[PDB]
């Protein structure tokens, strides 16, 4: 049994071992189209808090071929990792990042208190807590328009009954596990009419 050489590895090392991740509301989506997918380099990273695969077998990833692989990356709290799952309700699953009920992919979330936490407070990661409707699956919403909660119209300047819909995780190394930084990568596998170009060695 002989096969052609293994040449074009997919860039999972860039998705996982990134210097900085994106905020939850403006999550980072990376497309993967033409490369042999080595899912064995994922396990080379830190022990994961959550490795949950829906739709496909975790140990049969190299035996499948998909047309596209989407990698969504963000940083959430420790108590919001349960919301990254099909059919969940909460602050993240309704206003920031929604997965479809019939979801095919894998969610990988791991602790990053060493990286994304500062002793004085890491006021960089943001999340949206005010919205007027639940998000559709795989729909982003990047906006800084002042939310309106009262009957009085809100022109666009903050004030009474006028609040910005985004706040920040003030990540600190003295917080509990439920509020530590947690890097989350969601791999979604597409099976469109195009030929399956993401394969496995």
């Amino acid at each position, epitope marked *: 049994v002989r096969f052609p050489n293994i040449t074009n590895l997919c860039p999972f090392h860039e998705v996982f071992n990134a210097t900085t991740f994106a905020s939850v509301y403006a999550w980072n989506r990376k497309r993967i189209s033409n490369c042999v997918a080595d899912y064995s380099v994922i396990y080379n990273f830190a022990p994961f808090f959550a490795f949950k695969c829906y739709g496909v077998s975790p140990t049969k990833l190299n035996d499948l071929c998909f047309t596209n692989v989407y990698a969504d990356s963000f940083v959430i709290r420790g108590n919001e990792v349960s919301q990254i799952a099909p059919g969940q*309700t909460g602050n993240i699953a309704d206003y920031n990042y929604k997965l479809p009920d019939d979801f095919t992919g894998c969610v990988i979330a791991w602790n990053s208190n060493k990286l994304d936490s500062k002793p004085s407070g890491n006021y960089n990661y943001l999340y949206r807590f005010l919205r007027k409707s639940k998000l559709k699956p795989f729909e982003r919403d990047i906006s800084t328009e002042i939310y309106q909660v009262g009957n009085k119209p809100c022109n666009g300047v903050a004030g009474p009954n006028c609040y910005s819909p985004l706040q920040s995780y003030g990540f600190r190394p003295t*917080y509990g596990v439920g509020h530590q930084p947690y890097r989350v990568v969601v791999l979604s596998f597409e099976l469109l009419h195009a030929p399956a170009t993401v394969c496995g060695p």
Partner: antibody
Amino acid sequence: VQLVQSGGDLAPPGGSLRLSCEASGIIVSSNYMTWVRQAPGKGLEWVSLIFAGGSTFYADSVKGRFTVSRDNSKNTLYLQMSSLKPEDTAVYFCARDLREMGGLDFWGQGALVTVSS
Amino acid sequence: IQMTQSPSSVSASIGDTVTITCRASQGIPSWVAWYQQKPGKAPKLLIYGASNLQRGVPSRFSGSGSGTDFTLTISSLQPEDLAVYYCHQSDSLPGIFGGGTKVEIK
């Protein structure tokens, strides 16, 4: 600005009740709403929380029996108690939630529910 | 998660400074709110974010804290402060209300 509360009466150990809160000065559709009960002589206990989108969350004791609803035409927030118990006798408060930027800033007057005879 | 509070055995004279302390089981962000409930009345918000004074609330109420330790302070205990004071983690999907502290006049 104002949350006027209505409802609350004696119910049997299996009766169903509905408590209402009419909001003036705020839009119930655009705010988090919370129901918090206080037992007679006890502390404050969180019961229910409805979101602006429509997602509902309940406590472990009241899950499967209580339903928080919202009527948009009358700008009213409802708590429906399908199955009751002697432990549900309390004073219920409907509050506008401003989580992480104020919390429960506006409260209703409270409706008293007694479950006996 | 858990939010323990100092007991209700607080009795101070008029004008005395009163401190009420809240201790979380694990470290939480400074998103703790304080509530003042008079007998037969709904609770009234006092301080949100553990350091921000609510509009219409007298300046005698000062909040300060971080990590696991939070504190409410009444600089002068005027007679209008005979009420139960509750702590509340404002970012808890299941609401977490600590046992209130009953302030009494001696």
